[PDB]
Curated annotation (Swiss-Prot), chains A, B:
It comes from Rhizobium rhizogenes (strain K84 / ATCC BAA-868). It holds the Pfam family GFO_IDH_MocA. The keyword NAD applies. Keywords: Carbohydrate metabolism, Magnesium, Metal-binding, NAD, Nucleotide-binding, Oxidoreductase. Substrate binds at residues 95, 162, 175, 179, 229. It is an enzyme of class 1 (oxidoreductase). Signal peptide: none annotated. Pathway: Carbohydrate metabolism. This is D-apiose dehydrogenase. Belongs to the Gfo/Idh/MocA family. The keyword Nucleotide-binding applies. The gene is apsD. Its EC number is 1.1.1.420. GO terms for molecular function: metal ion binding; nucleotide binding; oxidoreductase activity.
Length: 342, 342
C-alpha cells in the first residue's frame, strides 16, 4: 500500500527530496506547502502536485497524509514538528534539528508523548562511501578502532545555492560540522568529552568557516573532526568527507575520488566506493542526492514495519549536543562534558 | 684550519653523526668517548679516530677540541653540557634535551653564563621535505597560514634499533612527538595553548604509542599533531612526516613519497621533495641521515659566523615545553598554557 506525504518548505534542497520521493517504493507526495507562492508554483508544476498550501496550519487542518516532510530552514522546525505531533502525523525534519538542544529535546519529548515517529533528515551517514566504512569496521577487518579522522575541507561556493549561510553569526559547525560529527558518532560511537576551535577566514561572511574538533569517544577512541570552507585545493573535493580509521589489527583510508583502502592481517584491498548517479542527479551533488533516496526509503520502510529510524530525533540529540558543545568550547576555550548536557 | 670536535656517546645513532662529520666542510672529529669499550673500539676503528676515552671527565681534562657533540642517552645530557660549559666548550646535545623542562632551562642558563653556543640536535626540521614546506610558506605563495596537520603514523619496529624505547613509562611523545611538535613550531610559530590525548595499543610496551595533540598558535593558526606507532598501513611510510597547511590564498600538501603539492592563485604545482641519498645513507632512514649532515654543517657555519643556531638551547625550550605540556594535558584532561611554563 501507498503512503501519502506532505512536504513543507519547497526550497533549494526540497527539489532533491521531491525527485527522491518519486523514486521511493511505497511512498509519494500528495501535497506541498510554502509561504512563498513563487516556490509553491515552481515545485508544484515541476512535480505535478495538485494540492498546494500557502501555510502549514491549513495543510494540517485539511489532513489527507500519512506523514510530513519538513524541509524549511531552522526557524520553523519546532513549530512544524509540534503541529505534526498535535495532529498525530509522523514527521521528518531537516537539519539543523533545532536552534538549541532545549528546543530539540522538547521536540523529541512532544513526539514521544504523541506516539509518532520523528526522524531528522541527516543524510551524510547514508552516503555509499560512509556506509562502506561502517561495514568494513563492523566486519572486524581492522580489529578494535582506537583513532579516527573525519575531514571535509572545501573551497566550493555553497553561498550561491544557499545565501543564508553567509548571514548567520554561526555557520560551518551548524551547517556542515553537524554532518561530520554525526559521521564520527556513526563510525566510532558516542562522545564523552569534546574540545573545539573556530576561525573566520572569508571576509564576505558573518560566521565561522573553519572548525577543528577533538573528540574523546566513550569506547576509548580519539577522533579529529576538521571542517573548512576556506581551503583552496587544486582539485575541489566537494562534497566528499574523507575518513581515516586506525584499529588494533588494521587501517581504513577513505580518500578523495571515493577510493577505499583497507589493510588487515590478510593484507591490503582497494575498492571503489563511488556513489551511483541517479537519473535526476547532478555532479558534484550526486553523492548527497543518492543519500536523500536512501534515507527517504529507510523512513518509508521503518514507518511500514513500525521500527525506529537510524537518525531518529532521540538519536539526533546526541549529534546535536556535540554541535552546541563545540560552540561552547570554541568561545570558552574549555573541554566540554557531553554527558552533562543530555 | 678545520674545527676539531669530540663526540661523546658512540651509540647506534652516533654512527650517522660520525659519517656526517666526515662530509661536513670546516669541521671533523678528533676524539671520541664511550663508557662501553666495545662501542669505543667499533666506532674508533670504523672512523680511524686515534684519541679514545672511557669517560668524559678525562676527555675534557685533556682538551684539544673546539666543540663537543653529545650523542649519549638523556640521563647524562645535563652533566655533559655542564662539563662543556665549565671548560668553555661549545656544545651540541642530542634530543630529548633533558629529563625535565627545569633541567633544560638550567642547562640553557649555564651555557649563556659561560658565553658558549648550545645547539640541540633536533634534525626533523632540517629534512629536505620539511625545508621545502617552510620555503613555500615563507614565499607567500599561499598567503597567511591558518590551519595545519603534522602527522607521523607508522607500524615500524623501532624497538629493535632502540630497545630503551620499549622500557620507559613515556614513549612516543618524548621520542617522536618531540620532533613533530618542533616541526609544528618551525612552520606555524610558537604555541600559546595545547591539548593532548594519549593511548597504549601495543600490549608489549610500558609507554604510550599513540598521541593526538591540538595546538593554538600565537599567530592565530590551529594545528593537529598526530603521532602513532600502532598504525598498520599497506605501504609503510616510516619515517616520513606528512604535512597539510591551509592559508588565505592556497594550500600545501606534503604526502607519502615526498610528493609536495602547492595550490595558489597561479594554479597547482606538484614537485618531488625527496632527500638526496648519501653514499653512507640507507633507505628508508636516508631522510633522517641527510638531515644529520644539514644540521651539523649548519652548526659549523654558525660557529664560524657567530650567529645563533636554529634549534639552539633557548629555542628548543619552546619545543620541550610542548612535550611536557602534552603529558600533563593527557593525564589531567585539561588545556595547558605554554607561556606560563616558560
Ligand atoms: N544534505 C542535506 O540534507 C541538506 C542540504 C542543503 C540544505 N539542507 C537543509 O535544508 C533546509 C532548507 O535549506 P534550503 O537551502 O532549501 O533553504 P531555502 O531557503 O532554499 O528553502 C526554504 C523554503 O522554506 C520556505 N519556508 C520557510 N519557513 C516556512 C514556513 N513556516 N512554512 C512554509 N514554508 C516555509 C521558504 O519560503 C523557502 O522556500 C535547511 O535547514 C538546511 O540546513 C540540508
Ligand atoms: N633523529 C635523531 O636525531 C635520533 C635518532 C635516534 C636516536 N636519537 C637520540 O640519540 C641519543 C642516543 O640514541 P642511541 O639509540 O644511539 O642510544 P645508544 O644506547 O645506542 O647510544 C648511547 C651510547 O652512549 C653511551 N653512554 C651513555 N652514557 C654515557 C656517559 N655518561 N659517557 C659516555 N658514554 C655514555 C652508551 O654506552 C651508548 O653506547 C638518544 O638520546 C636518542 O634520543 C636521535
Ligand atoms: C553540504 C552543505 C552545502 O553544507 C549543505 O548545506 C548540507 O547540509 O548538506
Ligand atoms: C623516532 C625515532 C625514529 O625512533 C628516533 O628516535 C628519532 O628520533 O629519529
Ligand atoms: Mg514514490
Ligand atoms: Mg669533515
Amino acid at each position: 500500500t501507498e503512503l501519502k506525504g506532505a512536504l513543507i518548505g519547497c526550497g533549494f534542497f526540497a527539489v532533491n527530496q521531491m525527485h527522491a520521493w518519486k523514486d521511493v517504493k511505497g511512498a509519494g507526495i500528495a501535497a506541498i506547502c510554502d509561504r512563498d507562492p513563487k516556490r509553491l508554483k515552481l515545485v508544484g508544476d515541476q512535480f505535478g502536485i495538485e494540492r498546494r498550501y500557502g501555510d502549514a496550519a491549513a495543510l494540517f487542518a485539511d489532513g489527507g497524509f500519512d506523514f510530513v516532510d519538513i524541509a524549511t530552514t531552522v526557524q520553523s522546525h519546532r513549530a512544524l514538528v509540534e503541529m505534526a505531533a498535535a495532529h498525530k502525523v509522523p514527521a521528518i525534519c531537516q537539519k539543523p534539528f533545532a536552534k538549541s538542544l532545549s528546543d530539540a529535546k522538547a521536540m523529541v519529548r512532544t513526539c514521544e508523548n504523541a506516539d509518532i515517529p520523528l526522524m531528522v533528515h541527516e543524510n551524510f551517514r547514508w552516503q555509499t562511501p560512509i556506509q562502506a566504512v561502517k561495514a568494513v569496521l563492523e566486519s572486524g577487518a581492522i580489529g578494535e578502532p582506537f583513532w579516527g579522522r573525519f575531514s571535509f575541507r572545501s573551497g566550493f561556493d555553497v553561498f550561491s545555492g544557499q545565501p543564508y549561510l553567509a548571514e548567520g553569526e554561526r555557520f560551518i559547525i551548524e551547517d556542515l560540522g553537524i554532518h561530520t560529527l554525526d559521521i564520527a558518532r556513526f563510525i566510532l560511537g558516542d562522545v564523552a568529552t569534546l574540545t573545539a576551535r573556530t576561525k573566520r577566514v572569508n571576509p564576505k561572511i558573518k560566521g565561522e568557516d573553519v572548525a577543528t574538533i577533538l573528540l574523546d569517544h566513550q569506547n576509548g577512541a580519539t577522533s579529529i573532526v576538521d571542517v573548512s570552507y576556506a581551503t583552496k585545493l587544486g582539485t575541489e573535493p566537494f562534497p566528499e568527507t574523507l575518513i581515516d580509521i586506525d584499529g588494533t589489527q588494521g587501517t581504513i583510508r577513505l580518500s578523495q575520488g571515493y577510493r577505499l583502502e583497507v589493510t588487515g592481517p590478510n593484507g591490503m584491498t582497494i575498492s571503489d566506493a563511488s556513489p551511483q548517479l541517479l537519473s535526476w542527479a547532478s555532479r558534484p551533488w550526486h553523492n548527497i542526492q543518492e543519500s536523500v533516496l536512501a534515507i527517504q526509503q529507510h523512513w518509508t520502510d521503518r514507518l511500514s514495519s513500525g521500527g525506529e529510524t537510524s537518525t531518529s530525533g532521540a538519536d539526533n540529540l546526541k549529534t546535536f549536543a556535540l554541535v552546541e558543545a563545540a560552540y561552547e568550547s570554541a568561545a570558552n576555550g574549555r573541554t566540554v562534558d557531553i554527558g552533562a548536557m543530555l
